Amino acid sequence: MDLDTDANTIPELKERAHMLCARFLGGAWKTVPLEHLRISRIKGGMSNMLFLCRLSEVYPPIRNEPNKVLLRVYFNPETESHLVAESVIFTLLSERHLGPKLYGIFSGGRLEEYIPSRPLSCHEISLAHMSTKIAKRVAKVHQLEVPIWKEPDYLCEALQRWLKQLTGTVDAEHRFDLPEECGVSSVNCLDLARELEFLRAHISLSKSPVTFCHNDLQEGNILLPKRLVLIDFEYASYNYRAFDFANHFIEWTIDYDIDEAPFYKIQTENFPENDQMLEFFLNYLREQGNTRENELYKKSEDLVQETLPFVPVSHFFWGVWGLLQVELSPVGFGFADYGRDRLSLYFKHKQLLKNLA
Amino acid sequence: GMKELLSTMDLDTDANTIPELKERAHMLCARFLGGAWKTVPLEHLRISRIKGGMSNMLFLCRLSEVYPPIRNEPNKVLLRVYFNPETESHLVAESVIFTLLSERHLGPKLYGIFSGGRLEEYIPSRPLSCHEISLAHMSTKIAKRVAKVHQLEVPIWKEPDYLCEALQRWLKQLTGTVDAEHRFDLPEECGVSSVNCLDLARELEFLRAHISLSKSPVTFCHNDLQEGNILLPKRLVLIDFEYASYNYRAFDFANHFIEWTIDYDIDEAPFYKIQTENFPENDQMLEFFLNYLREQGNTRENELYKKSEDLVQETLPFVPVSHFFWGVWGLLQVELSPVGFGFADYGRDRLSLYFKHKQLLKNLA
Ligand SMILES: [Ca+2]
Ligand SMILES: [Ca+2]
C-alpha cells in the first residue's frame, strides 16, 4: 500500500477487517457482505496504521453495535506485561469515559470508537492558548489511579526488549551512522546497550514524582472533537512525570506533516523557551490543586529543572524505537533517519541526564 | 518460583512462617499498591492463607496497626495465585474483564494483575456450600445474578471459541507432559476403560463439531459457577471471573447444575465427593430458568414456563461439555498445581461422566 491507496481495493485487508469487526462487534458486522463493508485509511501517527470500518446504509446495526469503528494496527513487539497493562488502561479509560469506547483488543491492534475530530499541528502545541489546555489535560492524566505496576520501570523495560530484538535483526559487525555533530559518528548494538545502562543508572537518581503517564504526548494524540482530548495511551504507564513533560516539549520541534522523505522535520530552535515551560507548569500545578497560589512560580521553576534530565531520555527511547521500526513497520515513514536523528540528539543532550549524578 | 515455593506448603502451614512467601507478597503489594506497603517491615506484614476453590491459592496480606496506609492504599489485599498456562488472548480478556467488573463496582476492586495471579480487594464474607446452592431461596438468587452477568457487554471476542481454544492448549501441554504411551484409566462403568492424549484429541474434535451446532444464545459467561465463587457478603455476589468469556449460555447453566453434585468440603482424599443423585431435577432446572428469564426482562409472564422448558433442552447437551472441559483441566493440573486436591482422580471422574453423557451432545446432530 501507500499514502493514497484505496483500502477497499485490497481484498485480503478487507477480509481481515471484516473478520475482526464481526468477532468483536457481532450483529450486522457478522453477516454484512464484503461489498457493503467500507474501509478507509485514516491519517495518524507513525506508530500505527488506522482504518475506519463502516457498514453501508443497506446493513445498519441490528442492536447496540456501532455502524462504524476504528481499527488501529501497531507494530511494536508485544510482551506479557504490555498486554495486561494496555488492556487495563484502555478498559479503564473507556469505562470512565476518558477516551473512545473500547470495542476489542487483539494481538497487534485494537478496535475503538471513531471520534470525528482533527489533531493539533506541530505549531499549534506551541501556541499559548493550546499549550495551556494541554497542560491542564496532562495534569488530569497524572492524577489517575490505574491498577498496574506503580514503579517507573517501563522506559528501561521497553528499551531493553526493543534493543534485544534489534540486536537480533542485524549482524554483530553492524553499526548505525550518526551525524558527527552529535559527538559520536556511529554506534553498534553493544554501544546502545552500554548507553542504556547509563540511562538506567541515572534516571533512577531522579526525584521526579512518579505518576500515571501518557508517554507519547505528540500533537497527533491531542485532538479537538467536532476542549482538547488526549488519546491513544499505547505507551502509557507509571513513569517519572518529568518524562511526559520532556517528551512533550521535544515534540514542539518535530513536525510530522512533511511530504518529502524522511517525512518529518526537526527544528530544535522551536523547543519551548524557559518561560514557556514555566507557563505550562503554572497551568499544570494550578490544575492539580495541591499548590498554593503564592508557591506556584517556584514550584514551576523546580519542575523545569526536574524535566531537563529527561530530554535525552526521550531522545534515546524513541531513537532505539525508530531503529527497530525499520524492520518491523510497514508505515511509510523514514524510521532509519528518525532513529539516527533522535539518537544524535540523545548524545547532544546526554549531559543533562549525567547531571543527576 | 512462586509455584515451587507453594508446593512445599500445606493446609496446616502458617503462611507467616514462610519468609520467601512474605518477601514475594511484600514485593507484589509494594509494586502494585505503593504507600505504606513499600516500607512496612516484614514483621508488620501479616499473611493468612484463605480457603478457596482448587483453581487457586489465596493469601490475605495485611499491614499491622503500626504501619497504617499513608494515602489511599488499602490496609489489606487478597493475593490470588493461579496455575493455568497463560495465553495472549487470555491475558487480554482477563485484564479487560477484571478492570470492567472493578470499574462498574460489580466485583472486588482490582489492584493489579501479574503473571500467574492478581491482587484485589478482600471481601468479608463466606461462600455457599454445595448443599446450599440446591436450596430454592439460594438458587433463585443465583439465577438472578447469572441473568445479569449474561446481560453484560464486554469488549472481548464475541464468538464462543473459548471452550475449545482453552482445551486445545491444555491438551497440547498435557500431551507434552506425559509419556507418549501413557494412558489415563477411567472407571469402566462409563463405557471407556482408558484414554491417551490422542483419544482426547479426537474427543475434542467431536465436541467441537457438535457444540457449534447448538442454537444456545451466546452471552458473556462466568464459566465456573461453583459454590466457591458464590459469596454472601458480611445479597449474593458472584466473583472470580478467571474463566469468563463469551460462550453458549447453556454451558454456564449446565456447569452450574453439575456443581450441585460436586462437593469440595471433603477432608479425606481426593478431597471432593460426587453424588450424581444430587443433580437438579427437571422441575428444579425449570424454576432456575423461570427466575433467570424473569430477571432478564425480555419475556412476557405468560411465556416464562414455556421458554424455561426450552432452556432445559438447550442446557442438557452441555452437561458432557462441562465434564470434558474440567476433566482435561483436572489432568493438566496434576502437573501444574501445588494445591492440595486429588486432580488425577478428579480428571478421571469428570472424564468418565463425559463419556457417560456423551450422547446428550451427539444429539445436537
Ligand atoms: Ca511533534
Ligand atoms: Ca460443587
XYZ file of C-alpha atoms and ligand atoms in Angstrom:
724
model
C 0.000 0.000 0.000
C 0.865 3.697 0.192
C -0.359 7.113 1.363
C -3.202 7.178 -1.198
C -4.076 3.507 -1.729
C -7.818 2.833 -1.567
C -8.078 0.356 1.327
C -11.360 -1.025 -0.069
C -9.490 -2.298 -3.135
C -7.306 -4.600 -1.065
C -9.352 -7.819 -0.657
C -7.109 -9.545 1.891
C -7.135 -6.418 4.054
C -10.890 -6.104 3.711
C -11.367 -9.718 4.840
C -9.167 -9.370 7.937
C -11.040 -6.212 8.903
C -14.358 -7.928 8.206
C -13.321 -10.821 10.478
C -12.102 -8.589 13.322
C -15.252 -6.446 13.270
C -17.544 -9.470 13.105
C -15.786 -11.206 16.003
C -15.553 -8.175 18.298
C -18.760 -6.387 17.342
C -21.212 -9.065 16.226
C -24.664 -8.079 14.992
C -24.710 -6.665 11.452
C -20.917 -6.916 11.214
C -21.203 -10.687 11.227
C -23.347 -11.078 8.095
C -22.673 -7.880 6.137
C -21.476 -8.736 2.610
C -17.905 -7.658 1.852
C -19.095 -5.078 -0.688
C -21.279 -3.453 1.958
C -18.339 -3.091 4.344
C -16.474 0.151 3.639
C -12.852 0.571 4.724
C -10.948 3.854 4.582
C -7.336 4.562 5.538
C -7.181 7.337 8.152
C -4.207 9.631 8.739
C -2.352 9.167 12.018
C 0.942 8.931 13.891
C 3.875 6.795 12.709
C 3.243 4.184 15.417
C 0.132 2.845 13.724
C -1.986 2.401 10.591
C -5.617 3.428 11.064
C -8.637 2.080 9.187
C -12.163 3.380 9.532
C -14.573 0.486 9.019
C -18.253 1.158 8.311
C -21.499 -0.615 7.413
C -23.300 0.660 4.312
C -26.767 2.117 4.887
C -28.081 -1.188 3.491
C -26.919 -3.166 6.538
C -27.468 -0.917 9.591
C -26.768 -2.135 13.152
C -29.368 -4.639 14.332
C -28.787 -3.954 18.035
C -26.339 -1.864 20.058
C -23.334 -2.352 17.778
C -21.912 0.813 16.132
C -22.239 1.499 12.395
C -18.560 2.433 12.150
C -15.426 1.608 14.118
C -11.744 2.485 14.083
C -9.265 -0.333 13.592
C -5.809 0.580 14.907
C -2.828 -1.594 13.951
C 0.548 -1.369 15.713
C 3.948 -2.883 15.033
C 5.581 -2.847 18.464
C 6.622 -6.283 19.748
C 4.163 -7.387 22.450
C 5.111 -8.670 25.896
C 3.100 -10.180 28.750
C 3.210 -7.065 30.920
C 2.348 -4.856 27.946
C -0.716 -6.866 27.005
C -2.027 -6.740 30.576
C -1.264 -3.050 31.189
C -2.711 -1.865 27.876
C -5.902 -3.850 28.411
C -6.312 -2.421 31.912
C -5.626 1.105 30.701
C -7.850 1.003 27.628
C -10.746 -0.543 29.549
C -10.443 1.965 32.402
C -10.344 5.000 30.082
C -13.306 3.552 28.180
C -15.316 2.814 31.335
C -14.673 6.247 32.854
C -15.491 7.966 29.560
C -11.990 9.461 29.399
C -11.426 8.204 25.868
C -13.176 6.498 22.935
C -15.226 3.441 23.811
C -13.147 0.267 23.609
C -14.561 -2.490 21.428
C -11.757 -5.022 21.370
C -8.068 -5.764 21.826
C -6.132 -8.291 19.779
C -2.527 -9.161 19.014
C -1.028 -6.059 17.437
C -4.075 -3.812 17.487
C -7.476 -2.761 18.746
C -10.907 -1.567 17.713
C -12.324 1.574 19.284
C -14.935 4.251 18.789
C -14.192 6.636 15.927
C -14.277 10.247 17.078
C -14.820 12.992 14.466
C -12.043 15.482 15.121
C -8.721 16.874 13.983
C -5.339 16.611 15.689
C -3.233 19.628 16.564
C -0.366 20.575 14.256
C 3.214 20.728 15.500
C 2.967 24.523 15.504
C -0.340 24.614 17.386
C 1.028 22.930 20.500
C 3.421 25.882 20.855
C 0.537 28.360 20.900
C -0.092 29.756 24.400
C -3.840 29.050 24.432
C -3.387 25.443 23.248
C -0.376 24.709 25.457
C -2.378 25.942 28.435
C -5.140 23.466 27.634
C -2.666 20.637 27.119
C -1.056 21.351 30.490
C -4.423 21.002 32.216
C -5.226 17.772 30.357
C -1.842 16.353 31.358
C -2.434 17.369 34.983
C -5.550 15.172 34.950
C -3.835 12.169 33.363
C -1.156 12.376 36.046
C -3.845 12.181 38.764
C -5.327 8.897 37.526
C -5.025 5.839 39.768
C -4.595 2.832 37.459
C -4.278 -0.746 38.747
C -0.927 -1.526 37.128
C 2.755 -1.662 38.163
C 3.470 1.578 40.080
C 7.266 1.768 39.775
C 8.767 3.623 36.744
C 10.340 0.534 35.174
C 8.530 0.942 31.834
C 11.110 3.043 29.979
C 14.024 0.724 30.714
C 11.961 -2.454 30.383
C 10.659 -1.440 26.955
C 14.032 -0.253 25.669
C 15.751 -3.393 26.914
C 13.405 -5.645 24.960
C 13.487 -3.400 21.884
C 17.283 -3.264 21.895
C 17.393 -7.026 22.451
C 15.165 -7.605 19.425
C 17.115 -5.035 17.395
C 20.364 -6.804 18.264
C 18.813 -9.928 16.770
C 17.837 -8.280 13.474
C 21.280 -7.022 12.485
C 24.707 -8.633 12.253
C 27.121 -8.029 15.130
C 29.509 -6.024 12.935
C 26.632 -3.702 12.009
C 26.915 -0.051 13.001
C 24.445 2.823 12.799
C 25.996 6.029 11.480
C 25.115 9.270 13.244
C 25.613 12.922 12.295
C 29.061 13.676 13.776
C 27.577 16.950 15.005
C 26.262 14.968 17.985
C 29.713 13.954 19.194
C 29.582 10.300 18.170
C 29.868 9.357 14.497
C 28.451 5.831 14.847
C 27.214 3.196 17.289
C 26.566 -0.550 17.290
C 24.093 -2.502 19.413
C 26.737 -3.090 22.097
C 27.178 0.673 22.497
C 23.411 1.174 22.702
C 23.376 -1.402 25.496
C 26.090 0.485 27.377
C 24.178 3.753 26.891
C 21.003 2.083 28.181
C 22.859 1.030 31.311
C 23.986 4.629 31.786
C 20.434 5.871 31.264
C 19.036 3.317 33.720
C 21.595 4.153 36.414
C 20.953 7.883 36.159
C 17.191 8.212 35.784
C 16.818 6.153 38.953
C 18.516 9.039 40.773
C 15.768 11.416 39.670
C 13.413 12.787 42.309
C 10.677 13.478 39.765
C 7.441 12.214 41.356
C 6.110 9.048 39.713
C 2.624 9.254 38.213
C 0.497 7.579 35.566
C 1.903 8.976 32.292
C 0.835 9.080 28.634
C 4.447 8.832 27.399
C 3.699 9.934 23.797
C 2.242 13.415 24.020
C 2.905 14.309 20.393
C 0.438 16.558 18.568
C -1.070 13.574 16.738
C -2.539 12.365 20.037
C -4.063 15.713 21.045
C -7.478 16.143 19.431
C -10.200 18.753 19.064
C -13.579 16.950 18.788
C -16.123 18.101 16.188
C -11.996 21.346 24.507
C -8.918 19.176 23.903
C -8.735 15.425 24.376
C -5.643 13.232 24.697
C -5.926 9.769 23.185
C -4.007 6.618 22.298
C -2.407 5.559 25.571
C -0.488 2.863 23.680
C 2.753 3.683 25.538
C 1.119 4.699 28.835
C 2.489 3.528 32.173
C 3.556 4.782 35.568
C 6.683 6.821 34.949
C 8.601 9.845 36.198
C 6.220 12.713 35.424
C 9.294 14.510 34.023
C 9.401 12.117 31.079
C 5.909 13.115 29.929
C 6.943 16.784 30.152
C 10.312 16.496 28.431
C 8.894 14.248 25.723
C 6.099 16.711 25.040
C 8.409 19.728 24.907
C 10.616 17.896 22.417
C 7.567 17.293 20.211
C 7.409 21.083 19.707
C 10.477 20.570 17.490
C 9.330 17.544 15.492
C 6.946 18.192 12.612
C 5.337 15.147 11.008
C 3.386 16.948 8.271
C 6.252 16.626 5.795
C 5.572 15.321 2.280
C 9.217 14.710 1.427
C 11.288 11.856 2.847
C 12.087 11.149 5.638
C 8.615 12.610 6.251
C 9.478 14.571 9.402
C 11.416 17.741 10.150
C 13.267 18.670 13.322
C 13.730 22.347 14.227
C 15.480 22.346 17.609
C 15.099 26.137 17.726
C 11.367 25.627 18.268
C 11.931 23.996 21.659
C 9.931 25.932 24.275
C 11.784 28.792 25.951
C 12.318 28.546 29.703
C 9.440 30.979 30.279
C 7.197 28.842 28.072
C 7.949 25.668 30.034
C 7.250 27.678 33.172
C 3.841 28.892 31.982
C 2.978 25.265 31.135
C 3.866 24.134 34.654
C 1.969 27.046 36.222
C -1.151 25.756 34.479
C -0.372 22.122 35.297
C 0.235 22.747 39.004
C -2.764 25.041 39.252
C -4.966 22.323 37.718
C -3.793 19.590 40.126
C -4.786 21.848 43.027
C -2.071 20.906 45.516
C -0.072 24.132 45.195
C -0.915 27.450 46.846
C -1.011 30.461 44.515
C 1.975 32.066 46.245
C 4.046 28.920 45.685
C 3.186 28.164 42.028
C 6.053 30.077 40.452
C 8.862 28.486 42.453
C 7.251 25.055 42.074
C 7.144 25.608 38.310
C 10.823 26.624 38.344
C 11.605 23.366 40.124
C 9.563 21.437 37.548
C 11.729 22.862 34.754
C 14.933 21.570 36.368
C 13.223 18.257 37.112
C 12.280 17.945 33.413
C 15.555 18.720 31.605
C 17.348 15.476 32.562
C 14.660 13.552 30.683
C 15.176 15.396 27.396
C 17.956 12.998 26.367
C 15.951 10.114 27.858
C 13.133 10.822 25.399
C 15.627 11.013 22.515
C 17.236 7.670 23.396
C 13.837 5.997 23.888
C 12.399 6.954 20.505
C 15.815 6.641 18.892
C 16.077 2.937 19.658
C 12.355 2.616 18.873
C 12.847 4.228 15.474
C 15.711 1.910 14.551
C 13.621 -1.145 15.461
C 10.583 0.055 13.498
C 12.801 -0.080 10.402
C 12.482 -3.858 10.146
C 9.024 -4.096 11.755
C 6.828 -1.282 10.451
C 5.113 -1.000 7.035
C 4.290 2.632 7.779
C 5.632 4.974 5.117
C 7.973 6.843 7.441
C 11.724 7.428 7.471
C 12.402 5.271 10.528
C 16.102 4.771 9.736
C 16.739 8.514 9.640
C 14.399 9.170 12.575
C 16.137 6.782 14.944
C 19.524 8.199 13.981
C 18.341 11.788 14.450
C 16.772 11.143 17.863
C 19.869 9.209 18.961
C 22.182 12.042 17.907
C 20.029 14.381 19.997
C 20.472 11.955 22.898
C 24.247 12.305 22.704
C 23.867 16.050 22.188
C 21.990 16.421 25.491
C 23.384 13.448 27.398
C 24.975 15.768 29.981
C 21.572 16.943 31.212
C 20.977 13.383 32.430
C 24.536 12.888 33.681
C 23.920 15.937 35.892
C 21.625 13.842 38.097
C 24.812 12.313 39.496
C 9.435 -19.822 41.564
C 6.221 -18.990 43.405
C 4.802 -22.357 42.328
C 7.860 -24.258 43.557
C 7.646 -22.419 46.881
C 3.951 -23.155 47.342
C 4.424 -26.859 46.633
C 6.427 -27.070 49.872
C 3.438 -25.740 51.848
C 0.247 -27.477 53.007
C -3.132 -26.827 54.655
C -1.609 -26.722 58.153
C 1.163 -24.269 57.301
C 1.145 -20.804 58.841
C 1.864 -18.523 55.883
C 3.578 -16.054 58.235
C 6.316 -18.606 58.937
C 7.328 -18.836 55.288
C 9.789 -15.932 54.772
C 10.118 -16.284 50.995
C 6.330 -16.142 50.708
C 6.253 -12.979 52.797
C 9.027 -11.481 50.676
C 7.218 -12.211 47.400
C 3.948 -10.939 48.834
C 5.737 -7.850 50.162
C 7.186 -7.094 46.695
C 3.854 -7.557 44.913
C 1.909 -5.359 47.339
C 4.658 -2.729 47.282
C 4.786 -2.636 43.477
C 1.028 -2.539 42.862
C -0.196 -0.624 45.935
C 2.699 1.626 46.979
C 2.453 3.804 50.077
C 2.925 2.040 53.407
C 3.245 -1.297 51.588
C 6.608 -0.118 50.248
C 8.371 0.295 53.599
C 6.382 -1.838 56.041
C 8.827 -4.132 57.877
C 8.231 -7.803 57.008
C 7.346 -8.416 60.658
C 4.455 -5.969 60.290
C 3.207 -7.558 57.082
C 0.743 -10.291 58.059
C -0.232 -13.085 55.663
C -3.004 -15.646 56.126
C -3.979 -18.483 53.787
C -7.656 -18.085 52.862
C -9.768 -21.074 51.818
C -10.734 -21.123 48.156
C -11.506 -23.221 45.096
C -8.986 -25.711 43.721
C -8.093 -23.393 40.826
C -6.125 -21.054 43.074
C -4.239 -20.412 46.306
C -5.365 -17.328 48.223
C -3.419 -15.191 50.715
C -4.790 -12.212 52.628
C -1.971 -9.705 53.125
C -2.317 -7.008 55.783
C -0.459 -4.071 57.302
C -0.283 -4.181 61.107
C -1.896 -1.303 63.004
C 1.636 0.073 63.463
C 2.092 0.811 59.748
C -1.293 2.097 58.504
C -1.989 3.465 54.981
C -0.375 6.849 54.349
C -2.591 7.598 51.356
C -5.441 5.869 49.518
C -3.921 2.387 49.553
C -5.948 -0.324 51.334
C -4.751 -1.735 54.667
C -5.235 -5.262 53.323
C -5.495 -7.023 49.966
C -6.182 -10.509 48.630
C -3.384 -12.117 46.618
C -4.707 -14.813 44.255
C -2.290 -17.223 42.580
C -3.374 -19.412 39.650
C -1.716 -22.302 37.826
C -3.371 -22.287 34.405
C -0.971 -21.838 31.475
C -1.413 -18.258 30.246
C -2.053 -17.218 26.649
C -2.035 -13.850 24.871
C -5.783 -13.939 24.297
C -6.389 -14.889 27.955
C -4.094 -12.255 29.439
C -6.034 -9.654 27.461
C -9.542 -10.989 28.120
C -8.924 -11.355 31.861
C -7.475 -7.856 32.131
C -10.471 -6.370 30.329
C -12.933 -8.405 32.351
C -11.426 -7.699 35.783
C -10.971 -3.993 35.049
C -14.551 -3.739 33.799
C -16.036 -5.522 36.820
C -13.938 -3.335 39.128
C -14.851 -0.067 37.401
C -18.572 -0.850 37.431
C -18.469 -1.996 41.059
C -19.760 -5.439 40.056
C -16.938 -7.129 41.930
C -13.976 -6.541 44.274
C -11.798 -3.589 43.257
C -8.839 -4.695 41.128
C -5.395 -3.645 42.360
C -3.125 -5.416 39.925
C -2.574 -8.298 37.540
C 0.720 -10.154 37.283
C 1.981 -13.409 35.768
C 0.048 -16.221 37.424
C -2.210 -14.126 39.633
C -3.684 -10.849 40.809
C -4.285 -8.541 43.771
C -7.839 -7.495 44.582
C -9.952 -6.078 47.401
C -10.731 -8.558 50.192
C -14.438 -9.067 50.823
C -15.547 -10.137 54.329
C -17.950 -12.956 53.537
C -18.426 -16.700 53.335
C -19.021 -18.859 50.270
C -22.062 -21.057 49.781
C -21.799 -24.771 50.478
C -22.517 -27.353 47.805
C -25.768 -28.183 49.593
C -26.827 -24.533 49.809
C -26.814 -23.941 46.040
C -29.507 -26.615 45.727
C -31.782 -24.640 48.064
C -34.657 -22.790 46.395
C -34.102 -19.404 48.037
C -30.400 -19.532 47.196
C -30.907 -20.985 43.707
C -33.321 -18.165 42.900
C -30.787 -15.508 43.880
C -28.044 -17.214 41.870
C -30.325 -17.443 38.835
C -30.881 -13.696 39.086
C -27.160 -12.878 39.310
C -26.413 -15.078 36.305
C -29.145 -13.302 34.325
C -27.233 -10.068 34.987
C -23.807 -11.468 34.049
C -25.299 -12.723 30.778
C -26.530 -9.211 30.009
C -23.052 -7.672 30.258
C -21.451 -6.153 27.179
C -17.714 -6.853 27.428
C -15.170 -5.675 24.812
C -13.649 -9.102 24.115
C -14.068 -11.866 21.484
C -17.824 -12.415 20.958
C -17.749 -15.879 19.383
C -17.895 -18.953 21.711
C -14.383 -20.202 20.876
C -13.090 -20.097 24.463
C -14.047 -23.655 25.464
C -12.255 -25.335 22.578
C -9.387 -22.849 22.404
C -8.544 -23.368 26.093
C -8.956 -27.154 25.899
C -6.794 -27.364 22.780
C -3.981 -25.530 24.543
C -4.362 -27.523 27.760
C -4.490 -30.828 25.894
C -1.374 -29.826 23.967
C 0.547 -29.060 27.160
C -0.710 -32.237 28.832
C 0.491 -34.165 25.773
C 3.956 -32.735 26.243
C 3.962 -33.629 29.950
C 3.166 -37.336 29.735
C 4.725 -40.427 28.161
C 3.511 -40.967 24.590
C 2.357 -44.439 25.628
C 0.761 -43.062 28.797
C -2.937 -43.759 29.232
C -5.337 -42.450 31.851
C -7.561 -45.186 33.243
C -11.267 -44.477 33.626
C -13.944 -46.360 35.579
C -15.213 -48.991 33.115
C -18.824 -48.261 34.054
C -18.613 -45.130 31.890
C -18.179 -47.058 28.645
C -14.492 -46.325 28.053
C -11.755 -48.033 30.088
C -8.909 -45.618 29.286
C -7.664 -42.848 27.004
C -4.372 -41.292 25.934
C -3.909 -37.729 24.701
C -4.557 -38.813 21.106
C -8.022 -40.065 22.053
C -8.748 -36.864 23.990
C -7.645 -35.047 20.855
C -10.290 -36.959 18.917
C -12.917 -36.352 21.598
C -12.245 -32.618 21.480
C -12.842 -32.606 17.726
C -16.122 -34.431 18.310
C -17.092 -31.913 20.987
C -16.069 -29.003 18.756
C -18.103 -30.346 15.824
C -21.277 -30.776 17.880
C -21.333 -27.719 20.144
C -21.053 -25.493 17.084
C -24.466 -26.887 16.137
C -26.106 -25.562 19.301
C -28.626 -22.746 18.956
C -27.961 -21.705 22.554
C -27.666 -17.892 22.529
C -24.085 -16.746 23.076
C -23.557 -14.416 26.035
C -20.825 -13.224 28.345
C -20.452 -16.189 30.740
C -18.742 -16.844 34.096
C -17.952 -20.472 33.168
C -17.179 -21.616 36.728
C -20.349 -21.109 38.719
C -19.372 -23.418 41.574
C -20.374 -22.649 45.182
C -16.867 -21.413 45.990
C -17.415 -18.393 43.744
C -20.843 -17.547 45.154
C -20.477 -15.378 48.256
C -22.663 -13.871 50.955
C -21.009 -10.562 51.980
C -20.956 -9.665 55.682
C -27.407 -10.448 48.888
C -25.246 -12.896 46.942
C -22.316 -11.909 44.777
C -20.553 -13.875 42.039
C -16.787 -13.441 41.976
C -13.603 -14.743 40.344
C -14.268 -14.482 36.600
C -10.979 -16.294 35.954
C -12.583 -18.446 33.228
C -15.117 -15.906 31.999
C -15.683 -15.391 28.272
C -18.435 -15.185 25.698
C -19.915 -18.664 25.423
C -23.141 -20.558 24.890
C -25.284 -19.512 27.864
C -26.122 -23.216 28.161
C -22.569 -24.011 29.251
C -22.940 -21.702 32.271
C -26.232 -23.408 33.198
C -25.072 -26.981 32.656
C -21.815 -26.379 34.512
C -23.653 -24.791 37.435
C -26.173 -27.607 37.671
C -23.329 -30.131 37.659
C -21.776 -28.282 40.601
C -24.798 -29.316 42.712
C -23.280 -32.813 42.546
C -19.674 -31.947 43.385
C -18.803 -31.153 46.996
C -15.325 -29.759 47.716
C -15.652 -29.605 51.523
C -14.141 -33.065 51.956
C -11.348 -33.686 54.468
C -10.174 -37.002 53.023
C -8.533 -37.559 49.635
C -9.160 -36.998 46.814
C -10.776 -34.090 48.713
C -14.060 -33.860 46.791
C -17.157 -36.041 46.525
C -19.532 -36.527 43.626
C -23.149 -37.559 44.131
C -24.859 -37.556 40.741
C -28.161 -38.137 42.548
C -27.987 -34.518 43.724
C -28.203 -33.165 40.178
C -31.212 -30.842 39.956
C -34.496 -32.425 38.886
C -36.084 -31.242 35.649
C -38.543 -29.009 37.515
C -35.720 -27.524 39.600
C -33.803 -26.515 36.464
C -37.103 -25.048 35.259
C -37.528 -22.936 38.393
C -33.985 -21.662 37.909
C -34.798 -20.580 34.362
C -38.111 -19.030 35.412
C -36.176 -16.646 37.652
C -33.360 -16.135 35.164
C -35.727 -15.295 32.294
C -37.851 -13.034 34.503
C -34.759 -11.135 35.645
C -33.626 -10.508 32.052
C -36.918 -8.737 31.336
C -37.296 -9.867 27.715
C -40.021 -12.431 28.392
C -43.773 -11.996 28.868
C -45.036 -13.535 32.115
C -47.303 -15.912 30.168
C -44.319 -17.286 28.255
C -41.895 -17.892 31.129
C -42.742 -21.539 31.780
C -42.531 -22.496 28.092
C -39.318 -20.567 27.456
C -37.921 -22.206 30.592
C -38.674 -25.626 29.109
C -36.717 -24.734 26.001
C -33.830 -23.665 28.237
C -33.669 -27.118 29.837
C -33.339 -28.816 26.432
C -30.829 -26.191 25.371
C -28.780 -26.935 28.513
C -28.622 -30.743 28.563
C -26.172 -31.081 25.646
C -23.611 -29.072 27.621
C -23.581 -31.421 30.600
C -20.966 -33.634 28.952
C -19.228 -30.495 27.635
C -18.607 -29.274 31.202
C -17.424 -32.742 32.226
C -14.926 -32.941 29.386
C -13.666 -29.387 29.970
C -12.877 -29.813 33.672
C -11.760 -33.390 33.109
C -8.933 -32.308 30.827
C -8.307 -29.330 33.117
C -8.050 -31.690 36.072
C -5.482 -33.931 34.387
C -3.274 -30.963 33.472
C -3.425 -29.502 36.992
C -1.845 -32.720 38.252
C 1.473 -31.446 36.881
C 0.991 -27.687 37.343
C -0.829 -27.164 40.649
C 0.597 -27.225 44.209
C -2.969 -27.130 45.552
C -3.932 -29.965 47.901
C -6.550 -31.615 45.699
C -6.705 -35.023 44.028
C -6.624 -33.718 40.446
C -5.742 -37.132 38.979
C -8.897 -38.699 40.425
C -10.879 -35.553 39.627
C -9.866 -35.524 35.971
C -10.710 -39.198 35.587
C -14.074 -38.812 37.317
C -15.214 -35.823 35.224
C -13.962 -37.554 32.056
C -15.929 -40.711 32.853
C -19.022 -38.524 33.322
C -18.288 -37.068 29.881
C -18.417 -40.493 28.230
C -21.418 -41.380 30.371
C -23.438 -38.458 28.976
C -21.742 -38.042 25.600
C -24.988 -38.946 23.815
C -26.600 -35.727 25.067
C -24.073 -33.809 22.984
C -24.216 -36.097 19.963
C -27.967 -35.449 19.877
C -27.395 -31.899 18.605
C -26.734 -33.658 15.297
Ca 5.816 16.972 17.188
Ca -19.992 -28.064 43.554
